[PDB]
Amino acid sequence: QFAKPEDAVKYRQSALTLMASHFGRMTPVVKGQAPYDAAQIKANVEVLKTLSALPWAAFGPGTEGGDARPEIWSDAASFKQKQQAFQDNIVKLSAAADAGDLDKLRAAFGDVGASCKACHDAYQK
Amino acid sequence: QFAKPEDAVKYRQSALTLMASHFGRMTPVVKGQAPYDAAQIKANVEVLKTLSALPWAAFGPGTEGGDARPEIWSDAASFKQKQQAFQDNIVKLSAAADAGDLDKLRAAFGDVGASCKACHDAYQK
Ligand code: HEC
Ligand code: HEC
């Protein structure tokens, strides 16, 4: 869907920005600093679910650039495992949000955040 | 969800970028230049649906900035009608995509695009 490789870079950065907002905005809720409204969080995690599937198709072949480390493409398969692991952790977060259980949400949220960091540590400059 | 007003600006620009990609990538399909796969389009329009609800909450009070014209806030209510009209046109597009009818998709797509332009004409610098 990208006319030039920089279009893919702009798309993925935008997706990751939105992901970060939908993930990070829950931090005060998981910490108990903002109230826990189960319906609010369920809705938000549904948006995060959708968003969290979007960046990976914009690291296609030939889309080298941005703050991506070249190893996204030089070890594409390690990168792929890290995206699928992250998405699997999003499934656990969705289940916790659908259950309406703050303890489960806290645990899942930490799992998701660890998965973000693991990919950054290897693939972000 | 924004620590400072510029955070809202970055969020909305990112949402609108993603919206534009999910909308514009269908152009060759509606023009007949790329094949029409009803399941492909149905899935894509579901993503566009989700995305199309996201920018408006990031034009909150006090989030003046970006390439937004000041009138988004000085006539907030005209801006609001234009967002709700755009979202209503997204509903028609979703219905066309769910029906799997290329003629209906073409008509809805044109309706949506006209709604994008109508808002830009009044509110984008
Ligand atoms: C499987 C790999 C991977 C996962 C998982 C991942 N990221 Fe990243 N992230 C990247 C890469 C690669 C970049 C740099 C992209 C670029 O500049 O081309 C990035 C960039 C970003 C950016 C900056 C985008 C910009 O505007 O330039 C943010 C914000 C971000 N990530 C947040 C997150 C959050 C929050 C999570 C987890 C909820 C997450 N990421 C999970 C790989 C990942
Ligand atoms: C109800 C108003 C409204 C509608 C509807 C709307 N836009 Fe916009 N658009 C804006 C405003 C306001 C900006 C500038 C936002 C800013 O810079 O703060 C903008 C900016 C953009 C940008 C640039 C974002 C960036 O990276 O800075 C793109 C791309 C875009 N719009 C595409 C679209 C498409 C495609 C549609 C329809 C599918 C659409 N817009 C519908 C109001 C709207």
From Swiss-Prot, chains A, B:
Residues recorded with modification Pyrrolidone carboxylic acid: 1
GO CC annotations, alphabetized: periplasmic space
One Pfam family cited in the UniProt record for this chain: Cytochrom_C_2
SUPFAM superfamilies: Cytochromes
Keywords: Electron transport, Heme, Iron, Metal-binding, Periplasm, Pyrrolidone carboxylic acid, Transport
InterPro entries named among the record's database cross-references: Cyt_c/b562, Cyt_c_II, Cyt_c_prime, Cyt_c_prime_subgr
UniProt subcellular location: Periplasm
PTM text: Binds 1 heme c group covalently per subunit.
Protein task: Cytochrome c' is the most widely occurring bacterial c-type cytochrome. Cytochromes c' are high-spin proteins and the heme has no sixth ligand. Their exact function is not known.
Protein name: Cytochrome c'
Organism: Alcaligenes xylosoxydans xylosoxydans
